[PDB]
Design a protein around this ligand. Structure first.
Ligand code: FAD
Ligand code: FAD
Ligand code: FAD
Ligand code: EPT
Ligand code: EPT
Ligand code: CL
Ligand code: CL
Ligand code: CL
Lengths: 555, 555, 555
């Protein structure tokens, strides 16, 4: 192709063309795709995501967007594309799914970068092992896919998949990002073992036990490395020997991941989702406290989550379908809708897994425990309307993917998500302060507060869901203002964020400045040591290669 | 475009083309302009200046001239043009107006440079603030423009503009040059506060308080830096904190200026221009002495100026309209014309600003003071013919722009100005010696001496106006000879020059050689430290980047 | 000497000794002085300042302190000391007086640095010129000194000195710092012309017209450069030709200054100080507004200043002599003391200079103007008690040095000053907000608010005077907390600070971060370009040489 709408910094159109020309020769035209005009800038749908830019853009739509897209056919092309990238110093921005909405979608930090669609061609479920209770996968496999493969293979009775909400995401893409899931295997990054990745220099590298080579049998001779089998222990024990490098690969530009080992929970032989509606707003506090011990003590098995009232309603309906009002709904109105929906001003969904005797016993403790809360009310999925959010999470908390959840994106007219996600202690006091701070700022911006706590063992990921209409330019600015403000406030009160969208990786990395940004400095050292040319995703997580001046690039 | 008439040193036509090609893609054809042929080399008019070379060329017309011209649309293009310039090592030569005639006009020091017309597109009066009594401006705003904007806005009653003579110049272009003006705010460079400029590396930089960022309001979110607002104090206090760098930006190649804060005098509530004709030639001496104390003591408010007789006549008429003679007019003839015109052999114009009581009082002191001079005669504008130079300066000394002054350029046939401008003490003895030295050399060259002293607090800028016919090649050589000689003589008697034309920046910088050119050496260090590639205006003020050999370049 | 109490980073005692040994050989033992023990750490008196560390230490007393001190005998030694410093990479920290208390005194940013006492030996008033109305000076001359020299020479009738409060400071030390003064020549940095300084490489450099060499007469032959005379125009016109570098020398580590030209106001031939007491606290607001126009309009000639009630009382007496109370005095109590002292809750001191007719006229306007304020009352110095602060400023506003002002340092027991100094618009609204913010934080810290506005043309330097007892460790921490907090708040509201103490140069430079700290980055580039080894005052104004890691050094 000829002329991209925008281009990588410090590069001639004459260069873009030779570069793209060569890629087309490698992956063939079917694979490459240049961004020549506005008609190409379409904001897709979750079902068919756009790989050119951010769908949920708080910023200008055409702000972050690719010079082109390229789907490598397999590892070898990746290695090759990598080498050309080095010759031209062209920036790459890898992605498996493009599903990362509310975090910038497929858009690259630095505009005019070539986006690698790792997913298109490397789509394969490489293995599923019952005894090891794990499977291996390429960037292409979405959760639904895996679920089907288990089901096609009748393996679903043998092993369950853990899943985030919307089931479309890339299993590994979500895992390198350290995304949350609902079953006991909810910590995605925790559950991996052995990875494979292309270095900036294009050299291959397996990790952990991935490194101990499978002995040579006559059948495996001649295989290219990428195609060679892993050793028996690779997917069973993560540590290997010597330094444990895997972390360098999460939320960072250190390299491109090509495959990855992920554990799978053996069917527990028991299950029952449940719900507990908390009547009042302030009940959030005692609730969290009651939970703290139940979590550490293992009463609560999976990653339970406290959901705000609006979140369950948003799934049930549009803001319009409840109030003609154009501003944040009052506490009164909030009390009203819960009455209409049979939910609490806060609602704790979670689950029990195991044989009946364990289940019965835990159920008791849990019910007995939450009773101290005046007005609590316990429902089972059966005990509820056939549309209820509980009837949906019941599948989620058992590895069944769904998409009923996107409906909440629809609260306003032109739906667009944007997640603020600070971390918070498993304390009623801390969780109450955080909620109040996030709420007031939301009110200041004219938006309805909406969110859900996801309970980890010693912490909770507070997920503020900023929905906003993607066409009001003013609203967007307010939103930007909103995010920027919240970040600073939570910072000023000990709260961090575990992930964010492109427009704020820079700001967020600065909050991590203990001892003079020592953490960021150590990274860049690693960064430059590993990728001299800054070819791979510069700016991801705020890490910049020496080539990009922090003055011109930061933001 | 294809082939420039001349080109930058060390560069292939193949390179010029790729470079220009890319610029055309950025600013679009309307903006770029290549110098392909002689028909392009037109010497304009003050009213419509030529951006390709020196209009008043003492040197060969086609000596200093551009390879092309380019008008950036806004800051972003400047940053971009800058980056390409670095890739090719192509020299830039920025300009806002092109109005700098008598100092080489729009012509670049090194030929084949691309000239940046900063003025065309960045034409905006960014702000006018009554309480701060200042305004902000882009390179595009000429004095007339500002005056109109104040007038359109009815603000003229609230704040007055200070102005040099011909009102066409760029307000900032004149200010970075440290040009003189007539009201109390006559020191242009003195009156600025906060600037913005593009470094050779293309990074943006505000200065002084310009650096303290305006807090983030929801309305200002997302704005590109160049478009972001300045903090409240930026334009009110020049110093900021730490080193005061602004000076690196005056009369130098350190960077490109994009906007600048300039003060504005609040309407004084009183005004009356005046004149005092000195009868004899030698009266210059006592006059200067009488003034010295009146300046320090604040009797004389604005920048008054002693004008030679010929200067006022030149405005009134052509040398032809007074004498068929082809050589410098005799003292006798000079005495004659003043009699015809009612002026002295020297004439002191100046002004009073304030309420009547202050005005009356100062007027007394001033009149009483100048009386010691036998034959002095005091006129008010009213007291004079309706063409008188005084009726003109009356507007000048009150911020009203005009253009009546160019008429003096017309003394000879093909008018061309060339300013010699040494500095001189506020002393009758020193001012008399300087005048005599400049005069004799003028006579040696066959030219009529013409000039005006502009009185600063502790010094006077002696401005010799070399008019000469731009077509006599011989006259030109004499002129060159004239300048070269004067520079050395005044040097040999402690006199410096505050500014000059391209053909003598080198010579002039050498006069500043105390301690082995230590001053020049310190600059080049800064120069190279800041612009490794010497992309920005090399040779301006004699400062050369390490790339240009002093042997090949000096002159 | 043998072993310093502390030492420069990255240096062996073996090296310190060879280094010091050599210096002793150059300047001779009388000149050098090593800091071996605690008995050396004495906190002096303003009258006899300590050159080893900070007298007013908010931080630990022995925190910032020298490895030794050295008084160069003259320029040549400076050049020499400089060269050795480069051989060892030993850090220097120059000072003329050591008088900079409330800004860290003589203490260096980086501990174990050698402190250059520029003042001891280079003590000379090099020149006083009546016609040019300026004089020249070495680091050694304090204001009192100059005043005496004018007086000894009977020149006091011919020219007045401008002066800050306490008359002990170095005339140039205060000027490079850009300190404030009271007469019309109150802007110290503004009033200079021509400087001389030693580069990090030890090469000499005159600036401005300083560069144009004085022609060679037989009498001046053979003179070393440092001893050579300046050209006639050097001290009369600051700009010179080409870049105006002087600013690189204010508040920065770019070089050591050895001499400097300073203007002197010709005796005005008229004078009368005055006072106007504002009754209420809130009257600050209308007062500022009434002043704004009087400043721009030139009604108010010199730098007038609005003084808080406590400030005038502190000079009159100890907090003890007014209230046994141990906490901030109430608005009621404040109203009381003013009644006792005959002052307003705010008090505007200022002056008139000129012949009677101008004086009378201005006086009218000023009185008439301030009348709108209910209860205002106008006193002349005569009209007041023989101890009144007005009887003191009357000398200050006429160039007479004094020291009556230190008495205010005595409000608490162990007096120690610490200045917070944000800049503020000449607006009642802006000045009121700033005052309120600074006050509340002061109350939070248990300290009495105390301060004075110093009125510039378009701005006011708000000077918060933090007095605190130098022995309460707790109070100190509160103070540190106080400063840190105020800086951030004023930042968050557009307010900057024009100067500060060592412990906060780093924080203050960070407020200046527009566009990603672009301003700081440009400086360090200049810094390293000019002093490769970071030998000169690293850390001054937060500028660090490449050798000092920002992680280890910042603070
Ligand atoms: C709209 C929404 C989003 C959402 C959610 C609910 C709704 C209504 N619930 C989520 C949940 O419960 N848990 C969770 O982790 N995320 C949830 N989201 C957000 C989002 O939909 C998911 O996180 C989703 O998994 C993200 O998209 P996907 O998984 O497809 O990831 P991607 O588009 O490929 O982006 C991945 C990023 O990581 C880096 N990356 C990706 N692949 C590679 C490879 N091969 N090598 C190196 N780096 C890689 C990139 O930096 C990319 O930005
Ligand atoms: C013919 C004449 C000229 C004249 C005058 C009277 C007559 C009859 N009276 C003047 C006066 O009273 N005071 C004065 O300062 N100049 C007077 N002149 C000379 C001239 O007309 C004016 O000085 C005029 O202001 C100069 O032209 P202009 O103001 O348009 O400046 P320019 O053409 O842009 O050239 C500016 C130079 O400075 C540098 N420059 C300019 N812009 C930038 C930016 N943005 N960034 C960096 N550097 C910049 C260039 O080096 C350029 O050469
Ligand atoms: C306690 C106090 C202080 C004070 C004041 C009232 C009171 C009660 N009133 C002041 C005023 O009205 N205006 C003002 O500017 N300052 C006032 N102060 C503070 C202080 O007393 C004065 O500012 C005083 O002038 C500062 O001390 P001094 O003038 O002696 O300066 P120094 O001790 O030499 O420190 C100078 C700093 O600048 C750099 N420096 C100094 N000399 C050089 C040389 N030769 N070369 C390079 N840099 C130099 C150093 O960085 C040093 O820190
Ligand atoms: C409580 C049900 C969850 C639905 C939406 C979860 C949104 C979400 C999940 C994980 C993230 O890292 C960021 C955001
Ligand atoms: C006395 C009236 C002035 C008209 C012409 C002034 C010419 C001039 C002004 C400023 C310069 O820096 C150089 C030249
Ligand atoms: Cl998802
Ligand atoms: Cl002009
Ligand atoms: Cl002082």
């Amino acid at each position: 192709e000829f002329r991209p709408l925008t281009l990588p910094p410090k590069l001639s159109l004459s260069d873009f063309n030779e570069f793209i020309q060569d890629i087309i020769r490698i992956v063939g035209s079917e694979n490459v795709e240049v961004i020549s005009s506005k008609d190409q800038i379409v904001d897709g749908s979750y079902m068919k995501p756009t790989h050119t830019h951010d769908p949920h853009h708080v910023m200008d739509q055409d702000y972050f967007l690719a010079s082109a897209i390229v789907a490598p056919r397999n590892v070898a092309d990746v290695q090759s594309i990598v080498g050309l990238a080095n010759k031209f110093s062209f920036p790459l921005w890898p992605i498996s799914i493009g599903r990362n909405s509310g975090y910038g979608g497929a858009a690259p930090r630095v505009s005019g970068s070539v986006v690698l669609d790792m997913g298109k061609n490397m789509n394969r479920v490489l293995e599923v092992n019952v005894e090891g209770a794990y499977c291996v996968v390429e960037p292409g496999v979405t959760y639904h896919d895996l679920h089907n493969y288990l089901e096609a293979n009748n393996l679903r009775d043998k092993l369950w998949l853990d899943v985030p909400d919307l089931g479309g995401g890339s299993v590994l893409g979500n895992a390198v990002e350290r995304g949350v899931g609902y079953t006991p295997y909810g910590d995605h990054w925790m559950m991996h073992s052995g990875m494979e990745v292309v270095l900036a220099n294009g050299e291959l590298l397996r990790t952990g036990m991935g490194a101990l080579p499978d002995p040579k049998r006559p059948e495996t001779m001649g295989l290219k490395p990428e195609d060679q089998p892993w050793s028996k222990i690779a997917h069973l024990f993560p540590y290997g020997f010597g330094p444990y490098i895997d972390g360098l690969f999460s939320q960072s530009n250190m390299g491109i991941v090509t495959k990855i080992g992920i554990w799978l929970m053996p069917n527990p032989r028991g299950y029952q989702s449940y719900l507990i509606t908390l009547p009042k707003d302030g009940d959030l506090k005692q609730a969290v406290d009651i939970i703290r011990p139940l979590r550490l003590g293992m009463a609560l098995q999976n990653v339970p989550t406290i959901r705000h009232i609006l979140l369950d309603a948003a799934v049930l309906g549009d803001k319009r379908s409840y109030s003609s009002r154009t501003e944040p709904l009052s506490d009164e109105e909030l009390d009203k809708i819960a009455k209409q929906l049979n939910l609490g001003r806060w609602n704790f969904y979670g689950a029990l897994y195991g044989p009946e005797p364990i289940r019965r016993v835990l159920w008791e403790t849990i019910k007995d425990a939450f009773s101290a809360i005046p007005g609590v009310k316990f429902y089972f999925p059966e005990d509820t309307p056939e549309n209820s959010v509980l009837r949906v999470r019941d599948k989620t908390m058992q590895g069944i993917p769904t998409y009923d959840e996107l409906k909440w994106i629809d609260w306003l007219p032109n739906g667009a998500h944007l997640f603020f996600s600070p971390i918070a202690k498993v304390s009623g006091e801390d969780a109450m302060m955080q909620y109040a701070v996030t709420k007031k700022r939301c009110q200041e911006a004219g938006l309805d507060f909406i969110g859900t706590f996801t309970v980890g063992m010693r912490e909770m990921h507070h997920i503020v869901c900023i929905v906003f209409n993607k066409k009001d330019l003013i609203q967007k600015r307010k939103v930007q203002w909103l995010m920027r403000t919240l970040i600073d406030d939570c910072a000023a009160n000990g709260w961090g964020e575990y992930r964010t969208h492109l427009a704020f990786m820079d700001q967020i990395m600065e909050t991590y400045n203990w001892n003079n940004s020592s953490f960021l400095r150590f990274n860049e050292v690693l960064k430059n040591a590993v990728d001299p040319n800054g070819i791979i995703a510069p700016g991801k997580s705020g890490v910049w290669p020496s080539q990009y001046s922090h003055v011109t690039w930061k933001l």
